[PDB]
Amino acid sequence: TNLCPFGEVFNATRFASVYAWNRKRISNCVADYSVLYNSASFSTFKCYGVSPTKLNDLCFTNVYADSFVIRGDEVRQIAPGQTGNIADYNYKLPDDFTGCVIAWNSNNLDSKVGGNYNYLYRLFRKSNLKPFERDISTEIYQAGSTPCNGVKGFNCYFPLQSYGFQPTYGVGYQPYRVVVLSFELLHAPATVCGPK
Amino acid sequence: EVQLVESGGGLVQPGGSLRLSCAASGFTVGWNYMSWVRQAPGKGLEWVSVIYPGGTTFYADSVKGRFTISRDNSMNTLFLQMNSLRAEDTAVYYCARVLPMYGDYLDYWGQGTLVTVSSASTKGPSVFPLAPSSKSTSGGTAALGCLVKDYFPEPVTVSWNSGALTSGVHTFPAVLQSSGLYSLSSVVTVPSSSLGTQTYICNVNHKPSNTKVDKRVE
Amino acid sequence: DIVMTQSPSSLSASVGDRVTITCRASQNIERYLNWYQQKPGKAPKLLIYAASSLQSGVPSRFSGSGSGTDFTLTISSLQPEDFATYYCQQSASSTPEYTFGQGTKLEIKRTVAAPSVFIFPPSDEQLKSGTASVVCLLNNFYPREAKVQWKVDNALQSGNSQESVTEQDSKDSTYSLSSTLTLSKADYEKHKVYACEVTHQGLSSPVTKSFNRGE
């Protein structure tokens, strides 16, 4: 009766910035998803392939829990086939994605008076991320023909930017915490199951 | 130095197609957010399209399904391919570089290219002199110019002495005549003395009709 | 779609004055608001981004302020070169949904200037095409309100002339006007004296410029 550590992911004190999104692997555990699906805490609960209930009756080779913070304005980018700054340069879901995207407003936790500057996102990148790719590059982005040699200036821009969450922002600009559960199924025997 | 130069605009029949080009110099288009904005004659600015550095594209509702944005890196050029053009698409089209640092704002714009959607035909202008007279002597000042008549579509470009003469030059906005063709005048005031010493030539250019005219006045 | 309404639609002020343009958003856009300046026939120029950030290279007399739904663009001391149309633009959504305000046209007010009047009979080359265009030119006047009356020998003419006005010169803030009277060669040869009569505020009484067909 080794239950999986979903509380460590959902009830964590601090969340990762989306460009450096956190991934925790879930293996050799009994998973009770009831705690999450019958929960009034979440504003977003989209499931692909699987159904949100149906869920404690299935098994999987591995479960990946990816956590980060974006603005609610961008939550709809966490979905297959989406485009935009977040989907292109921060966190990309595959087209055959089977899993659930769970999101909730976190203004009590991630907004600070005068701005919270600990949550960043990538604005500049040469090409789109592949599904489940992670880029923690900090190199100055060269927008012009002249190189930048680690110096900022015209046509040389830092590739990351702070969200700057303030509690007075509108709900569209407020911080939302996002957890993406991916259900990996392999040849190998299943290691994560519901109480079923 | 930074430059954006638009080209490819002209006369297109309703339902037709046209590809606009935007040659860039300072920045490399491949690595930049780029945007097409349009402005109908006498009206305001209307966002048309935007392409991200990764290649993802976005279009205003007025043009989705008909316009497609693309780019050529080796040419360092942004492209706007327009299909199924309607009369409401008649406008000046600007390309602009977009920076995403505080929302999206357009920090460098080209000077635009005019796209006229009409069922009329291209017609080159006639260039006539407006000669200096005694009738044209304001004290010690003499006015002279060129009448650019009966052309379609806009625009024409008028320079003086191949660009060497720019002071006192007024190129009036074109007016649409009864006919349905455009007419325009470009005048310049000079000291009367100059009329004996310097030569005055209006250079008229109408690229929709491949017309180039150099007309000397008096 | 966010709707940006600018006020006023048009505005006139004198050199050295302080000028304020307001722009209001249909919804909360925080500080994702930019201000652009467009002079006639030239490329739009970014003045302000992020509501209050002054763009590199823009004179310090330009100031931006506001947040939420109300924003203002201020010119602390108006210059003649500042005649233009100013546009606010919203970029609130992370997905491109840009919208512009309708723009405010700012013209420079200055002292009265009377026009200089010239008249051009039709080219001899145009008369071989069977048409005659007579041009009357009003140069460097203010205010823009002038009246051009074509008189084909005290017979006031109507319906056969068009006129075009330049936009405000960005150094002396004056206007210029072109009036074109067009006739068949046949109708041109039916009359003798062609005159344009200009009435303008800077003129004690109307000024007429005339010629006679064939010198």
Side-chain angles (χ1 to χ4, degrees), chain C residues 4-23:
Chain C
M4 311 299 299
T5 304
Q6 257 168 272
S7 309
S9 310
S10 56
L11 180 37
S12 319
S14 301
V15 170
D17 290 348
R18 188 166 132 275
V19 179
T20 307
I21 309 315
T22 48
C23 161

mmCIF file with all atom_site columns, all heavy atoms in Angstrom, chain C residues 4-23:
data_model
loop_
_atom_site.group_PDB
_atom_site.id
_atom_site.type_symbol
_atom_site.label_atom_id
_atom_site.label_alt_id
_atom_site.label_comp_id
_atom_site.label_asym_id
_atom_site.label_entity_id
_atom_site.label_seq_id
_atom_site.pdbx_PDB_ins_code
_atom_site.Cartn_x
_atom_site.Cartn_y
_atom_site.Cartn_z
_atom_site.occupancy
_atom_site.B_iso_or_equiv
_atom_site.pdbx_formal_charge
_atom_site.auth_seq_id
_atom_site.auth_comp_id
_atom_site.auth_asym_id
_atom_site.auth_atom_id
_atom_site.pdbx_PDB_model_num
ATOM 1   N N   . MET C 1 4  ? -10.373 50.144 -28.438 1.00 0.00 ? 4  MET C N   1
ATOM 2   C CA  . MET C 1 4  ? -9.617  51.298 -27.973 1.00 0.00 ? 4  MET C CA  1
ATOM 3   C C   . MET C 1 4  ? -10.217 52.555 -28.585 1.00 0.00 ? 4  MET C C   1
ATOM 4   O O   . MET C 1 4  ? -10.221 52.707 -29.812 1.00 0.00 ? 4  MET C O   1
ATOM 5   C CB  . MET C 1 4  ? -8.143  51.179 -28.362 1.00 0.00 ? 4  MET C CB  1
ATOM 6   C CG  . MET C 1 4  ? -7.506  49.847 -28.024 1.00 0.00 ? 4  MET C CG  1
ATOM 7   S SD  . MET C 1 4  ? -7.544  49.498 -26.262 1.00 0.00 ? 4  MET C SD  1
ATOM 8   C CE  . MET C 1 4  ? -6.587  50.861 -25.639 1.00 0.00 ? 4  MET C CE  1
ATOM 9   N N   . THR C 1 5  ? -10.697 53.459 -27.739 1.00 0.00 ? 5  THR C N   1
ATOM 10  C CA  . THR C 1 5  ? -11.289 54.712 -28.196 1.00 0.00 ? 5  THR C CA  1
ATOM 11  C C   . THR C 1 5  ? -10.374 55.862 -27.804 1.00 0.00 ? 5  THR C C   1
ATOM 12  O O   . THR C 1 5  ? -10.007 55.997 -26.631 1.00 0.00 ? 5  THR C O   1
ATOM 13  C CB  . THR C 1 5  ? -12.687 54.913 -27.613 1.00 0.00 ? 5  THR C CB  1
ATOM 14  O OG1 . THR C 1 5  ? -13.510 53.786 -27.942 1.00 0.00 ? 5  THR C OG1 1
ATOM 15  C CG2 . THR C 1 5  ? -13.317 56.179 -28.179 1.00 0.00 ? 5  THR C CG2 1
ATOM 16  N N   . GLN C 1 6  ? -9.995  56.672 -28.788 1.00 0.00 ? 6  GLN C N   1
ATOM 17  C CA  . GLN C 1 6  ? -9.082  57.788 -28.599 1.00 0.00 ? 6  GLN C CA  1
ATOM 18  C C   . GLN C 1 6  ? -9.857  59.100 -28.559 1.00 0.00 ? 6  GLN C C   1
ATOM 19  O O   . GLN C 1 6  ? -10.899 59.246 -29.203 1.00 0.00 ? 6  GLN C O   1
ATOM 20  C CB  . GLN C 1 6  ? -8.037  57.829 -29.718 1.00 0.00 ? 6  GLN C CB  1
ATOM 21  C CG  . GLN C 1 6  ? -6.665  57.320 -29.316 1.00 0.00 ? 6  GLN C CG  1
ATOM 22  C CD  . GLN C 1 6  ? -5.753  57.101 -30.511 1.00 0.00 ? 6  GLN C CD  1
ATOM 23  O OE1 . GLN C 1 6  ? -5.748  56.031 -31.119 1.00 0.00 ? 6  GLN C OE1 1
ATOM 24  N NE2 . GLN C 1 6  ? -4.983  58.124 -30.860 1.00 0.00 ? 6  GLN C NE2 1
ATOM 25  N N   . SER C 1 7  ? -9.338  60.060 -27.790 1.00 0.00 ? 7  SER C N   1
ATOM 26  C CA  . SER C 1 7  ? -9.983  61.355 -27.643 1.00 0.00 ? 7  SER C CA  1
ATOM 27  C C   . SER C 1 7  ? -8.941  62.455 -27.496 1.00 0.00 ? 7  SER C C   1
ATOM 28  O O   . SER C 1 7  ? -7.941  62.267 -26.785 1.00 0.00 ? 7  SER C O   1
ATOM 29  C CB  . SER C 1 7  ? -10.928 61.378 -26.435 1.00 0.00 ? 7  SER C CB  1
ATOM 30  O OG  . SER C 1 7  ? -11.820 60.279 -26.473 1.00 0.00 ? 7  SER C OG  1
ATOM 31  N N   . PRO C 1 8  ? -9.128  63.597 -28.171 1.00 0.00 ? 8  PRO C N   1
ATOM 32  C CA  . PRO C 1 8  ? -10.210 63.756 -29.148 1.00 0.00 ? 8  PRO C CA  1
ATOM 33  C C   . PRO C 1 8  ? -9.841  63.133 -30.485 1.00 0.00 ? 8  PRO C C   1
ATOM 34  O O   . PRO C 1 8  ? -8.739  62.612 -30.626 1.00 0.00 ? 8  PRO C O   1
ATOM 35  C CB  . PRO C 1 8  ? -10.350 65.273 -29.275 1.00 0.00 ? 8  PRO C CB  1
ATOM 36  C CG  . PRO C 1 8  ? -8.987  65.792 -28.965 1.00 0.00 ? 8  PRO C CG  1
ATOM 37  C CD  . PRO C 1 8  ? -8.382  64.850 -27.958 1.00 0.00 ? 8  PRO C CD  1
ATOM 38  N N   . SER C 1 9  ? -10.769 63.159 -31.443 1.00 0.00 ? 9  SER C N   1
ATOM 39  C CA  . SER C 1 9  ? -10.456 62.675 -32.783 1.00 0.00 ? 9  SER C CA  1
ATOM 40  C C   . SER C 1 9  ? -9.497  63.621 -33.498 1.00 0.00 ? 9  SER C C   1
ATOM 41  O O   . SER C 1 9  ? -8.605  63.176 -34.229 1.00 0.00 ? 9  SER C O   1
ATOM 42  C CB  . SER C 1 9  ? -11.739 62.477 -33.583 1.00 0.00 ? 9  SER C CB  1
ATOM 43  O OG  . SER C 1 9  ? -12.676 61.719 -32.836 1.00 0.00 ? 9  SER C OG  1
ATOM 44  N N   . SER C 1 10 ? -9.675  64.928 -33.310 1.00 0.00 ? 10 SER C N   1
ATOM 45  C CA  . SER C 1 10 ? -8.783  65.928 -33.878 1.00 0.00 ? 10 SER C CA  1
ATOM 46  C C   . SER C 1 10 ? -8.498  66.989 -32.825 1.00 0.00 ? 10 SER C C   1
ATOM 47  O O   . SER C 1 10 ? -9.281  67.200 -31.897 1.00 0.00 ? 10 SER C O   1
ATOM 48  C CB  . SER C 1 10 ? -9.381  66.572 -35.137 1.00 0.00 ? 10 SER C CB  1
ATOM 49  O OG  . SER C 1 10 ? -10.652 67.140 -34.865 1.00 0.00 ? 10 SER C OG  1
ATOM 50  N N   . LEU C 1 11 ? -7.358  67.658 -32.982 1.00 0.00 ? 11 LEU C N   1
ATOM 51  C CA  . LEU C 1 11 ? -6.879  68.600 -31.980 1.00 0.00 ? 11 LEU C CA  1
ATOM 52  C C   . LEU C 1 11 ? -5.904  69.571 -32.632 1.00 0.00 ? 11 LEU C C   1
ATOM 53  O O   . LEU C 1 11 ? -5.059  69.168 -33.436 1.00 0.00 ? 11 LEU C O   1
ATOM 54  C CB  . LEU C 1 11 ? -6.202  67.864 -30.815 1.00 0.00 ? 11 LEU C CB  1
ATOM 55  C CG  . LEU C 1 11 ? -5.628  68.658 -29.637 1.00 0.00 ? 11 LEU C CG  1
ATOM 56  C CD1 . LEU C 1 11 ? -6.491  69.859 -29.271 1.00 0.00 ? 11 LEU C CD1 1
ATOM 57  C CD2 . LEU C 1 11 ? -5.450  67.753 -28.434 1.00 0.00 ? 11 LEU C CD2 1
ATOM 58  N N   . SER C 1 12 ? -6.021  70.844 -32.272 1.00 0.00 ? 12 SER C N   1
ATOM 59  C CA  . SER C 1 12 ? -5.131  71.884 -32.766 1.00 0.00 ? 12 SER C CA  1
ATOM 60  C C   . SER C 1 12 ? -4.570  72.662 -31.585 1.00 0.00 ? 12 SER C C   1
ATOM 61  O O   . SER C 1 12 ? -5.298  72.997 -30.646 1.00 0.00 ? 12 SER C O   1
ATOM 62  C CB  . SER C 1 12 ? -5.857  72.821 -33.737 1.00 0.00 ? 12 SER C CB  1
ATOM 63  O OG  . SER C 1 12 ? -6.709  72.083 -34.597 1.00 0.00 ? 12 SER C OG  1
ATOM 64  N N   . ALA C 1 13 ? -3.269  72.932 -31.632 1.00 0.00 ? 13 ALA C N   1
ATOM 65  C CA  . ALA C 1 13 ? -2.593  73.634 -30.552 1.00 0.00 ? 13 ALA C CA  1
ATOM 66  C C   . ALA C 1 13 ? -1.423  74.416 -31.131 1.00 0.00 ? 13 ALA C C   1
ATOM 67  O O   . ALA C 1 13 ? -0.998  74.191 -32.268 1.00 0.00 ? 13 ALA C O   1
ATOM 68  C CB  . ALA C 1 13 ? -2.125  72.666 -29.459 1.00 0.00 ? 13 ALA C CB  1
ATOM 69  N N   . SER C 1 14 ? -0.899  75.338 -30.332 1.00 0.00 ? 14 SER C N   1
ATOM 70  C CA  . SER C 1 14 ? 0.171   76.218 -30.772 1.00 0.00 ? 14 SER C CA  1
ATOM 71  C C   . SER C 1 14 ? 1.520   75.712 -30.281 1.00 0.00 ? 14 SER C C   1
ATOM 72  O O   . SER C 1 14 ? 1.609   74.871 -29.383 1.00 0.00 ? 14 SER C O   1
ATOM 73  C CB  . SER C 1 14 ? -0.058  77.646 -30.271 1.00 0.00 ? 14 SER C CB  1
ATOM 74  O OG  . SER C 1 14 ? -1.290  78.163 -30.744 1.00 0.00 ? 14 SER C OG  1
ATOM 75  N N   . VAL C 1 15 ? 2.578   76.234 -30.901 1.00 0.00 ? 15 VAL C N   1
ATOM 76  C CA  . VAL C 1 15 ? 3.931   75.793 -30.586 1.00 0.00 ? 15 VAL C CA  1
ATOM 77  C C   . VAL C 1 15 ? 4.263   76.170 -29.150 1.00 0.00 ? 15 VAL C C   1
ATOM 78  O O   . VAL C 1 15 ? 3.987   77.292 -28.705 1.00 0.00 ? 15 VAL C O   1
ATOM 79  C CB  . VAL C 1 15 ? 4.937   76.397 -31.573 1.00 0.00 ? 15 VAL C CB  1
ATOM 80  C CG1 . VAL C 1 15 ? 6.359   76.145 -31.101 1.00 0.00 ? 15 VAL C CG1 1
ATOM 81  C CG2 . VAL C 1 15 ? 4.721   75.813 -32.951 1.00 0.00 ? 15 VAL C CG2 1
ATOM 82  N N   . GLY C 1 16 ? 4.838   75.226 -28.409 1.00 0.00 ? 16 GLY C N   1
ATOM 83  C CA  . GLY C 1 16 ? 5.167   75.446 -27.022 1.00 0.00 ? 16 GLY C CA  1
ATOM 84  C C   . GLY C 1 16 ? 4.098   75.004 -26.050 1.00 0.00 ? 16 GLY C C   1
ATOM 85  O O   . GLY C 1 16 ? 4.374   74.921 -24.847 1.00 0.00 ? 16 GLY C O   1
ATOM 86  N N   . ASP C 1 17 ? 2.886   74.735 -26.530 1.00 0.00 ? 17 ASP C N   1
ATOM 87  C CA  . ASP C 1 17 ? 1.804   74.307 -25.659 1.00 0.00 ? 17 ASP C CA  1
ATOM 88  C C   . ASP C 1 17 ? 2.029   72.875 -25.181 1.00 0.00 ? 17 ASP C C   1
ATOM 89  O O   . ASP C 1 17 ? 2.817   72.112 -25.746 1.00 0.00 ? 17 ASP C O   1
ATOM 90  C CB  . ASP C 1 17 ? 0.458   74.411 -26.376 1.00 0.00 ? 17 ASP C CB  1
ATOM 91  C CG  . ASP C 1 17 ? 0.024   75.847 -26.597 1.00 0.00 ? 17 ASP C CG  1
ATOM 92  O OD1 . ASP C 1 17 ? 0.641   76.755 -25.999 1.00 0.00 ? 17 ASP C OD1 1
ATOM 93  O OD2 . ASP C 1 17 ? -0.935  76.067 -27.370 1.00 0.00 ? 17 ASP C OD2 1
ATOM 94  N N   . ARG C 1 18 ? 1.332   72.525 -24.108 1.00 0.00 ? 18 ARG C N   1
ATOM 95  C CA  . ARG C 1 18 ? 1.270   71.160 -23.608 1.00 0.00 ? 18 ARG C CA  1
ATOM 96  C C   . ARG C 1 18 ? 0.008   70.508 -24.152 1.00 0.00 ? 18 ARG C C   1
ATOM 97  O O   . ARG C 1 18 ? -1.081  71.086 -24.066 1.00 0.00 ? 18 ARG C O   1
ATOM 98  C CB  . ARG C 1 18 ? 1.278   71.134 -22.078 1.00 0.00 ? 18 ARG C CB  1
ATOM 99  C CG  . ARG C 1 18 ? 1.402   69.753 -21.467 1.00 0.00 ? 18 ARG C CG  1
ATOM 100 C CD  . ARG C 1 18 ? 1.758   69.841 -19.990 1.00 0.00 ? 18 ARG C CD  1
ATOM 101 N NE  . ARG C 1 18 ? 0.897   68.992 -19.172 1.00 0.00 ? 18 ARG C NE  1
ATOM 102 C CZ  . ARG C 1 18 ? -0.294  69.361 -18.710 1.00 0.00 ? 18 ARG C CZ  1
ATOM 103 N NH1 . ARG C 1 18 ? -0.768  70.569 -18.985 1.00 0.00 ? 18 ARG C NH1 1
ATOM 104 N NH2 . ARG C 1 18 ? -1.012  68.523 -17.973 1.00 0.00 ? 18 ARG C NH2 1
ATOM 105 N N   . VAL C 1 19 ? 0.159   69.323 -24.733 1.00 0.00 ? 19 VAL C N   1
ATOM 106 C CA  . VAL C 1 19 ? -0.927  68.633 -25.417 1.00 0.00 ? 19 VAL C CA  1
ATOM 107 C C   . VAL C 1 19 ? -1.109  67.265 -24.779 1.00 0.00 ? 19 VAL C C   1
ATOM 108 O O   . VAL C 1 19 ? -0.129  66.574 -24.482 1.00 0.00 ? 19 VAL C O   1
ATOM 109 C CB  . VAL C 1 19 ? -0.635  68.494 -26.926 1.00 0.00 ? 19 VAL C CB  1
ATOM 110 C CG1 . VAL C 1 19 ? -1.762  67.755 -27.627 1.00 0.00 ? 19 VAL C CG1 1
ATOM 111 C CG2 . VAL C 1 19 ? -0.406  69.859 -27.553 1.00 0.00 ? 19 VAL C CG2 1
ATOM 112 N N   . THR C 1 20 ? -2.365  66.874 -24.566 1.00 0.00 ? 20 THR C N   1
ATOM 113 C CA  . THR C 1 20 ? -2.676  65.585 -23.965 1.00 0.00 ? 20 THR C CA  1
ATOM 114 C C   . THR C 1 20 ? -3.715  64.868 -24.811 1.00 0.00 ? 20 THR C C   1
ATOM 115 O O   . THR C 1 20 ? -4.769  65.432 -25.120 1.00 0.00 ? 20 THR C O   1
ATOM 116 C CB  . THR C 1 20 ? -3.184  65.742 -22.527 1.00 0.00 ? 20 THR C CB  1
ATOM 117 O OG1 . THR C 1 20 ? -2.253  66.529 -21.776 1.00 0.00 ? 20 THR C OG1 1
ATOM 118 C CG2 . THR C 1 20 ? -3.321  64.382 -21.866 1.00 0.00 ? 20 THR C CG2 1
ATOM 119 N N   . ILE C 1 21 ? -3.411  63.624 -25.171 1.00 0.00 ? 21 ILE C N   1
ATOM 120 C CA  . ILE C 1 21 ? -4.311  62.739 -25.899 1.00 0.00 ? 21 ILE C CA  1
ATOM 121 C C   . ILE C 1 21 ? -4.678  61.602 -24.959 1.00 0.00 ? 21 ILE C C   1
ATOM 122 O O   . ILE C 1 21 ? -3.809  61.066 -24.264 1.00 0.00 ? 21 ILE C O   1
ATOM 123 C CB  . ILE C 1 21 ? -3.653  62.181 -27.180 1.00 0.00 ? 21 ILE C CB  1
ATOM 124 C CG1 . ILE C 1 21 ? -3.056  63.300 -28.037 1.00 0.00 ? 21 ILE C CG1 1
ATOM 125 C CG2 . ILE C 1 21 ? -4.653  61.362 -27.989 1.00 0.00 ? 21 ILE C CG2 1
ATOM 126 C CD1 . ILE C 1 21 ? -3.958  64.493 -28.200 1.00 0.00 ? 21 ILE C CD1 1
ATOM 127 N N   . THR C 1 22 ? -5.952  61.229 -24.924 1.00 0.00 ? 22 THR C N   1
ATOM 128 C CA  . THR C 1 22 ? -6.375  60.146 -24.054 1.00 0.00 ? 22 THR C CA  1
ATOM 129 C C   . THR C 1 22 ? -6.823  58.962 -24.899 1.00 0.00 ? 22 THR C C   1
ATOM 130 O O   . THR C 1 22 ? -7.286  59.122 -26.029 1.00 0.00 ? 22 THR C O   1
ATOM 131 C CB  . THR C 1 22 ? -7.503  60.585 -23.114 1.00 0.00 ? 22 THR C CB  1
ATOM 132 O OG1 . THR C 1 22 ? -8.513  61.269 -23.862 1.00 0.00 ? 22 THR C OG1 1
ATOM 133 C CG2 . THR C 1 22 ? -6.963  61.520 -22.041 1.00 0.00 ? 22 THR C CG2 1
ATOM 134 N N   . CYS C 1 23 ? -6.672  57.769 -24.335 1.00 0.00 ? 23 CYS C N   1
ATOM 135 C CA  . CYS C 1 23 ? -7.049  56.531 -25.000 1.00 0.00 ? 23 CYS C CA  1
ATOM 136 C C   . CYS C 1 23 ? -7.590  55.572 -23.951 1.00 0.00 ? 23 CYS C C   1
ATOM 137 O O   . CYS C 1 23 ? -6.967  55.379 -22.900 1.00 0.00 ? 23 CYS C O   1
ATOM 138 C CB  . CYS C 1 23 ? -5.844  55.930 -25.742 1.00 0.00 ? 23 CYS C CB  1
ATOM 139 S SG  . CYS C 1 23 ? -5.954  54.184 -26.173 1.00 0.00 ? 23 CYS C SG  1
#
